[PDB]
Amino acid sequence: RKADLTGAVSVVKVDEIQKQGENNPVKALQGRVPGMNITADGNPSGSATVRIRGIGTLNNNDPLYIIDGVPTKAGMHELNGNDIESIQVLKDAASASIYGSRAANGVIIITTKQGKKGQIKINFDASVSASMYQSKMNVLNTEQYGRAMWQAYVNDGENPNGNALGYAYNWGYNADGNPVLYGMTLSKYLDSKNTMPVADTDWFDEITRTGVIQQYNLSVSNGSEKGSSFFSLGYYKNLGVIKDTDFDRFSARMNSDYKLIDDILTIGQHFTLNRTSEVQAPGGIIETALDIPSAIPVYASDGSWGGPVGGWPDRRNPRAVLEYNKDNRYTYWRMFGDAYVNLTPFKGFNLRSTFGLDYANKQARYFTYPYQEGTQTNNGKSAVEAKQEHWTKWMWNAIATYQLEVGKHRGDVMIGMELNREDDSHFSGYKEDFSILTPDYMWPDAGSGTAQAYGAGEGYSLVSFFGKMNYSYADRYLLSLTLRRDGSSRFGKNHRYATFPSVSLGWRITQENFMKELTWLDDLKLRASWGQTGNQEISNLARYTIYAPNYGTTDSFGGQSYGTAYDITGSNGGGVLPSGFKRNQIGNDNIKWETTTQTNVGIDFSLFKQSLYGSLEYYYKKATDILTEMAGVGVLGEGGSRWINSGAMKNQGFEFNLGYRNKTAFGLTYDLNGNISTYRNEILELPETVAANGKFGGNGVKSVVGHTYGAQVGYIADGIFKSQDEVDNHATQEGAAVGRIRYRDIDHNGVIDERDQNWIYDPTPSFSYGLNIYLEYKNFDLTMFWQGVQGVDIISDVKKKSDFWSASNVGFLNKGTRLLNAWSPTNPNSDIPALTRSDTNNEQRVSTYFVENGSFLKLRNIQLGYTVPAVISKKMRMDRLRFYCSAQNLLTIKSKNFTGEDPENPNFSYPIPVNITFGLNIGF
Amino acid sequence: GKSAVEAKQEHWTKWMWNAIATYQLEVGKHRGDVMIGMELNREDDSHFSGYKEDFSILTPDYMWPDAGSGTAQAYGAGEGYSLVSFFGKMNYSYADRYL
Amino acid sequence: FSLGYYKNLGVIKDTDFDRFSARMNSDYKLIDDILTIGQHFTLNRTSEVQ
Amino acid sequence: DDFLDRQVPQGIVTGDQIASPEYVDNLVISAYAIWATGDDINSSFSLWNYDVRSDDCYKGGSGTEDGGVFNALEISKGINTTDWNINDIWKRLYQCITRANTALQSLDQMDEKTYPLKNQRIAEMRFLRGHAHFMLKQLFKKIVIVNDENMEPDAYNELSNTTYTNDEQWQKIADDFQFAYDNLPEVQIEKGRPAQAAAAAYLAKTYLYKAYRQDGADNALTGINEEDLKQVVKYTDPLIMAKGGYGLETDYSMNFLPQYENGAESVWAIQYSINDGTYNGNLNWGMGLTTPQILGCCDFHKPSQNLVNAFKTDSQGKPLFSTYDNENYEVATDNVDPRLFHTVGMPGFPYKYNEGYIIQKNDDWSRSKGLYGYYVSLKENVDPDCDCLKKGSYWASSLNHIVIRYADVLLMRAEALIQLNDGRITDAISLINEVRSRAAGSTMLIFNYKEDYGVNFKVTPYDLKAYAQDEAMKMLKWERRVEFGMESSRFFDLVRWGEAKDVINAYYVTEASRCSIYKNAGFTENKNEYLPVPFEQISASNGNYTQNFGW
Ligand SMILES: OC[C@H]1O[C@@](CO)(OC[C@H]2O[C@@](CO)(OC[C@H]3O[C@@](CO)(OC[C@H]4O[C@@](CO[C@]5(CO)O[C@H](CO)[C@@H](O)[C@@H]5O)(OC[C@H]5O[C@@](CO)(OC[C@H]6O[C@](O)(CO)[C@@H](O)[C@@H]6O)[C@@H](O)[C@@H]5O)[C@@H](O)[C@@H]4O)[C@@H](O)[C@@H]3O)[C@@H](O)[C@@H]2O)[C@@H](O)[C@@H]1O
Ligand SMILES: OC[C@H]1O[C@@](CO)(OC[C@H]2O[C@@](CO)(OC[C@H]3O[C@@](CO)(OC[C@H]4O[C@](O)(CO)[C@@H](O)[C@@H]4O)[C@@H](O)[C@@H]3O)[C@@H](O)[C@@H]2O)[C@@H](O)[C@@H]1O
Ligand SMILES: [Mg+2]
Ligand SMILES: [Mg+2]
C-alpha cells in the first residue's frame, strides 16, 4: 500500500533488506531502487552517499529521511536498521512535497516496527561474519622495484649504478644493442648507520587484517485492540580490514501507542537512543601504503618503527600511522524521539499534534604522538585535542484532516502547520608538551605547552503552511492538489516566504467497463504529476557580509592560514600580537528559494492475477534559481564568494521495475525482481566565475554549461610512439620521444598545446540495473542479488601510479606490478609508455589515458538459509527457528578495458571486503 | 577591561549489570526464600574546557573561542571506578509468626 | 508514558531553572509466565542559571 | 512572527558594523597580517618560486616533477596559461590589495580631529597597496589597477587590465608611493610600520622601473626616459635616507641573522614572529621549502654554479667579466668575494656559520641525488640551534624578510646616475666602491676560513676615474648580481634591462652540461619575459582581460 498512490513512490521490501545484514539500511538497498544511486566506500560504519534522480542542484544533495514522521538528514548508519517495518522512497516532487520543505532531493520514508494487534512476538537475531580484504593492489617487491628502476635508468640513458639506493646492477647489451639486466644486488643496510636493514615488506598485507563483525538484536512487540508497544535492543560491532579501525553501536528503541475513551485521544510515541564508538582510518592511508617502497622494513634494528633513510622517498610508515591513530576514538550519542497526540471530534475529523526531537552529542579526543621514522619526524611534537559537538533539532507539527465518502466521491482535505528548529555548536581545547605519551596521561590539565581554544555555533529555523486535497471518483479517477508556503531564517524578510504548488492525476484504466474481457490484465494505472519544490540547503550565514577575527590559532598546511596577527612592533613575538578582522564572504540580500519543477509520467501494470507486476516511469526535473556560492572575480580578493540564484539544471530519466513470482509443480517458489534505470544530466545556466574556476566540471579550461555535471576536459592519447619516424610524422610537441604518449592534434595547427583539449570524462552511466532472485524449496530459501552498472567512465588515479615511473610529486615511489610490462625495444607488444625518470612529455596531464570503463556487474549479496520444521520448533517452544549463511561482495565481473580492480572504488578510498556471515533467527 | 569566555563540557557514564537467582518454598508452615546475586557497577567521568580572552563586541552571540583574540587555556581530566558484589539473602518464616 | 515540564524563576533576578522530562516504562510477558522482559527509561533536559 | 528572527550571526561581525571607528585600527593591522600569513609554500611574497627562471638558482626538490609548473617556468618550455601557481599568486596578491582597500575605505570615513593619525594610517595602507601592485606589475606586465577603495563589488566585474597603458599603470602605482612619502612620518617607533625613507626608496624603485619604457605590443625596450631617472635621483637623495637613520651595516651577514633584525640597512621588512599566541607563530612559511635536507625535507631553492663562479674574483679584486664561468671556482687557487659564504653554502664548509654542521656531497644534503647540485642557500636559512626555528609541518623561522635594503637604494641611485650620463658617473662609481668596501670588511664570521679551508678573499674598490657608459653599466650589473644573489631580483632586473633573452639562453647553454634539466630549455624573445595572465581570470572576465604578447 503506497502512501500516495498517485506519485513516483518505490516500496522496498524490508525482509530482503535485513538479509544482507548491513548496519546501514540505506546501504542495503544500494541497487534495489530505480533512479537512486548509493555509493559506499567500505568503512566499518555504514556511512554512504545517496543521490535520488541524479544530481538535482548545485547544493547539498542528500535526501530528507523521515523516521516516524520526524524529518532528518543525518545518516542511518548511527541508527538501528533492524526494527524497520516499511521503507518508501518518494522520488516525485508532487508526492514528496507534503512531507517537508526539504524534499527537493527526494524523501525516504522509514516506518519503525510497532506491536501487532492482539498478539506478542519476540525475535532474537545473531550474526557473526568474517570480512576479508580482496582488492589487494599489486605493487612491486624489492627485486621488481630494482628492475623497474634499472629499466628507467637505461631508458633515460643514464648510469643505473648511480641510483644511490644500494642497488648494484650487473647488466650488458644484447646482439641488437638493447640493454639487458643480468642480476642485481643490494646493500644489507639502507643507511651507513646500520639502523635500517633491507627487507621485502608487503605493506598492504602488513596494514590489513581479517575483520570480525558481530550483530545481536532482540526485539519484542506487543499489540492489543486497545493499545500497543515495542521494545528493541541492538548491538553491532565491525572491525575493518585496515588495522586499528573499528565501529561499534548500541541501540535501544521504545515505541508505544494508547487509545483512550473509545477512539478519541490516541497518544503515541517513538524513541530511540544510540551510542556509536568509532576509530576511523587516517586520510590517505592506502595512498601511503602504495607509495612507500617495499625495501623499507617495518621495524628498525633497535625495535623502533622503520622509515626512509638516505635517498629513499619521504613517506611515513603506514603501520606506524595506524598504531598512532588507534587512540583517536570518538563517541557519538544519537537521540531520535517523537510524541504525538491525535483527537477525533467525530468520524471524519482528525487533529494531530506532533513533537519530534533529535539530539546528537559527539565527544572526541585526538592525540599527536612524537614519531621518528628514519628521516620522517615531527620534531618530537606531542599534543591532545579534546573536541565536543552538540546538535539539537526539534519540530512541531499540527495536522487537521477531514474525510468524506459522499456516494462514489471520496474527498480528503488536510491542512498543516510545521516548525523546524535546529541549533548546532562545537568547542575544542588543544594542549601540547606531554611527557608520558599515553592516552591515560594525555589530558589538557597534564599538558605543559601552548594551549588553544576553538568554538563556534550556528542554527536555523523553518516555518511551513501546507495543504493537500485528494479527490477520488468511482475509485477510478484520482486528483491531488498540494500547496506549500515555506519560509526560512536563511533569507531576508522580503524573500523569506515562497509558494510551491503541485498537481497529480491518475486513471485506473482497468476499472473502465470497456475491457472486462481482458482477464489476463489484472490491473493497469496511468498517472501524471507536475510539482514545484523549494530548496534552501545553503550556509546559515549566506546573506551577511562576514567579517571574522581570524587570529590564526587554527592549524594550516603550507602556512596559508590567512590569520590576522602581525608583530607591528617588531619584537619577534613574546606576547599577544595586535589582531583585526578579515572578510569571509560578501552578503547578498536578494537570495531566495531555489525552485525545482518536476514532471513525472508513470504506468503501473499487474498481469496474471498479481503474478507479473511492474512500473515504468519517465521524469523531467528542472532546477532554476539555484543558490550557488560564486567565487570572486579574482581581483575582488578574499571573501569575494557570495550566494546567488544563477543556476539551472536539467535531468531526464527513465525507470523500469518488473517482478514475477510463481510456484512450481514439484514445490519450488521463485520470485524475480528486476530493475533498470537511466538518466541524463545537463547544466543550462551557470555564473561566469563558477564556470571559469571549473568547480562543477571543465577543469577550468572550458565552461561546463551545456554538458553533464562533473564532466572533465582533457587531452586525447593516440597510443604511444614506437619509432623516430612516428615522432617526426606526428605534430610537434614538447617532450616527444620514442615510447612516449602521443597526443592528438584537435585543431590541426601542427603543435600540441593547451588548446588541444576536449570533453573526455562524463560521470553518467548508460544504465544501472539490479536483479533479486528468491527461491524457496523444502525449507530452503536462497537469495541472490546482482547489481550492474553499464556505460560509466572513471578517472583512475591508481593508474597514474601504476603505468608510469616518476609520475608523482616525489620520485622513487613504489608503483604497480603492471609497470613491469612497459614498452621497450625488447618488448614491443605493449601500450604502457616506456619508463623514464623525467616527465618531459608531461604525462600527468588530464587525458583519455586515465579514463577507464567502469562498467561492472557484482553479486552484492547471496544467502542460503534453512528453516527448522515447525514440529521441532514447536517442541522447542520456538515459533520460528532459522539458520543462514551469506556472502556479500563475493564475486564481480569487470570490463577488460579497466586495468585496475574494484571498479566501484577505483581510487585510494576505503577498500570493499568480502563478507562471509553465519546467522540465526529465533522466534520464541 | 577583562573579557573572557569559558566553554566547559562534562560527561558521566555509569552502568550496572545484575544477576539474581531466587527460589521460594512453601513446605507446610515453613516459608523459605533463598536468593543469590552478582552485581557489577562501572562509572567513568570526564570533563574538558576551553578558555579564551580579548573579545570586542561583548555579547553572548559573539563570545565564542574562535572569535577571541587573546590567551587561550585548555583544561581536562578524567576518572572512574568499578565495584563487584556477590551477595546472598535467606528468609525463613514459621507460622507467619517467626521471621 | 509520561511527559513533564517544570520552570522556576527564583526570587533573585536572572536566576532560573527549567526541566523537560520524558519517561517510558514497559513490560511484556511471553509464553505463559516465563520470559518477562521489561524496561524503564527516562530522559531529562535541565537548563539553569544560578 | 519572531520565530525566524531571533537568531543572529555567531562569532562574526556583519558588514555594516565593520565601518565603526573602534575597529579601523584592527583593520589596519589586518592589512599587515596578510603579508605574513597570506603566502603559501609554493607562492611566497619574496617571489623565489618565480625567480628560478633566472640564472641564480635551480628548483630544488626530489626532481623535475616536484613542482612541474615551476620546472616548466625554469626551463621556459611547456608553460600553459592554465597553471595553478600563476592563478594562485595572482589571487593572493589581489587578496592583499583588497584587504588594504577595505582598511582604506574604513579609514576614509573618519574625522581628522578625532583620529589625529588618519593621514599616517592612510599613507601606510597606500604604501602596502602600491607594494602589492608593484609586485603584480613585476610578475605580470598587464595588471588590473584596483586603486578605488569606495568601489562596490559588482563594479569589480567591469575592471580591465587595458584601461591604462604601461606608463599610465606605472604612474598609478607610483601615485600611492608619492602620497605615502608626502604623509608618512620620518621615523616610526614601531618597526613594522614603514617610514618615509622606505616610501621614498620604493617610489624611486618604481620610477626606475618606469624609466625602461616597454611601449608597443611586444615586451621590447623602446628607450630610456630622462624625467623618470631625474625623479629617481631626486627621491634617492642621501639626506632623506640619513634623516630616517638608515645606512649600510658594518657586516653583510647581519642582514640575514635573527640577532640583528630591524637593523640600519633594513629599510622595511616583513615582521615574522614566534611564540605569539598563534598555532605555530607567524613564521616565514613561504621559505619553508628552502630548508636543506639536514633540516629534514624538500631541499628547495638551491643556488646554481653560475652564481658561485660569478662570486669569483681576479688577482686585482675585480670580478671576472668574461672568464668567470669558463671553469668552476676552486677554493685553493681562486680569489673569492667574501659575500659568497654569506649567500651560498658550499660543500666542505660550515652551514650558516655552524661548525657542528658541515655540508657534504651526499644524500644528507641533497634530495635530488646531485641533479640540482649540492649548494645550499643561506640568506633565508637560519642556524639549526637558533631556537627561532620551529617545525610546523615545514621548517620555518622568524627571520624577517627585508623587502628594501639600503644597498638596493644605493645601486638604484648608481644605475640612474649611469643612465643619465649627465657627467655624474663618478658618483655611481663611488656608490659601487662603498658597496664593495662594505663587502670586503664583512668577514667577522668567516675570518678563520683562511686558516681552516685555504680561502683567499680579494675585493677592492674601483678606481675613481672616467668610465664609459657601457663599462660602468656592466660593473653595476655585476655588483647587483654579486650583491643580491638568492634575493629573488635577478630575473626582474634582466627583464627591466631588456637583455633577459640573451643572458637566459647563455645560462641554459652553459648549464646544460652540468644540469640535464636544461637539455631542452629555451627562452622566447617576446613571450617568456612575463608571466601570462591566468586563463581562469580571462574566462571569468570575458572581453576585459587581454593576454600578454606572444601567447
Ligand atoms: O590547487 C589546484 C591544484 O593544485 C595541486 C596540483 O598538484 O596542488 C597544488 C596545491 O597543493 C599545495 C599544498 O599546500 O602544494 C603542493 C605542491 O607543492 C610541491 C612542490 O611544488 O610539494 C611541496 C613539498 O611538500 C611535500 C612535504 O611532505 C611532507 C608531509 O608533511 O612535509 C614534510 C616536510 O616538512 C615531509 O616530511 C613530508 O614528505 O609533500 C607535500 C605534498 O604531498 C601531497 C601531494 O601528492 O601528498 C603527499 C602526502 O601523501 C602522504 O602519504 C599522506 O599524508 C603523506 O606522506 C604526504 O603528505 C600532498 O598531500 C602535499 O601537498 C613534499 O613531498 C613536497 O616536496 C609539490 O610536490 C606539490 O604538488 C599547495 O601549495 C598548492 O596550492 C592540487 O592540489 C590541485 O589539483
Ligand atoms: O561534515 C560537514 C557538516 O557536517 C555536520 C552536520 O551534521 O556535522 C558533521 C560533523 O562531523 C565531522 C567530524 O566531527 O565529520 C563527520 C564524521 O562524524 C560522523 C559521526 O557519525 O558523522 C556525523 C554527522 O555527519 C553524518 O554522518 C552525515 O550524514 C551524519 O549522519 C551525522 O550527523 C561520521 O559519520 C563522520 O565520519 C565533521 O564533518 C563535522 O564536525 C556539521 O557539523 C558540519 O558542518
Ligand atoms: Mg593543436
Ligand atoms: Mg622577526
Author numbering:
A (entry chain A): 93 to 1016
B (entry chain I): 472 to 570
C (entry chain I): 323 to 372
D (entry chain B): 2 to 552
Paper text:
Glycan uptake across the bacterial outer membrane (OM) of these bacteria is mediated by SusCD protein complexes, comprising a membrane-embedded barrel and a lipoprotein lid, that is thought to open and close to facilitate substrate binding and transport. Here we show that for both the levan and dextran utilisation systems of Bacteroides thetaiotaomicron, the additional OM components assemble on the core SusCD transporter, forming stable glycan utilising machines which we term ‘utilisomes’. Transport-competent FOS are generated from levan by a surface-exposed lipoprotein, a GH32-family levan endo-glycanase (GHlev), while an SGBP (SGBPlev) is thought to recruit levan at the cell surface. Single particle cryogenic electron microscopy (cryoEM) structures in the absence and presence of substrate reveal concerted conformational changes that demonstrate the mechanism of substrate capture, and rationalise the role of each component in the utilisome.
All SusDlev lids are closed, tightly capping the extracellular face of the SusClev barrels, relative to the open position in the apo utilisomes. 3D classification reveals that the major source of heterogeneity present in the data was the presence of sub-complexes missing one or more accessory lipoproteins (ED Fig. 3b), so to probe substrate binding within the closed transporter complex, we first performed targeted refinement of the SusCDlev core, using particle subtraction to remove the signal for GHlev and SGBPlev from the images. FOS1 is found at the interface between SusClev and SusDlev, and consists of six β2,6-linked fructose units with a β2,1 decoration on fructose-4 (numbered from the non-reducing end). A second binding site (FOS2) most likely consists of four β2,6-linked fructose units, and is bound at the bottom of the SusClev cavity where it contacts the top of the plug domain. In the apo structure, this region (SusClev loop 8) is mostly unresolved, likely as an artefact of masking during image processing, whereas in the substrate-bound complex SusClev loop 8 contacts SusDlev and FOS1 via F649. In the substrate-bound structure, W685, which sits at the base of loop 8, shifts inwards, nudging F583 up and S193 down. This in turn results in a downward shift of a plug loop containing S193. In the apo structure, Y191, which is part of the same plug loop, forms a triple aromatic stack with Y89 and F558 that links the wall of the barrel (F558), the TonB box (Y89) and the plug domain (Y191). When the plug loop with Y191 shifts towards the periplasm, this stacking interaction is broken, resulting in release of the N-terminus and an ~35 Å shift of R93, which in the substrate-bound complex is the first visible residue. This would plausibly make the TonB box (D82-G88) available for interaction with TonB to disrupt the plug and generate a channel for substrate diffusion into the periplasmic space (Supplementary Discussion).
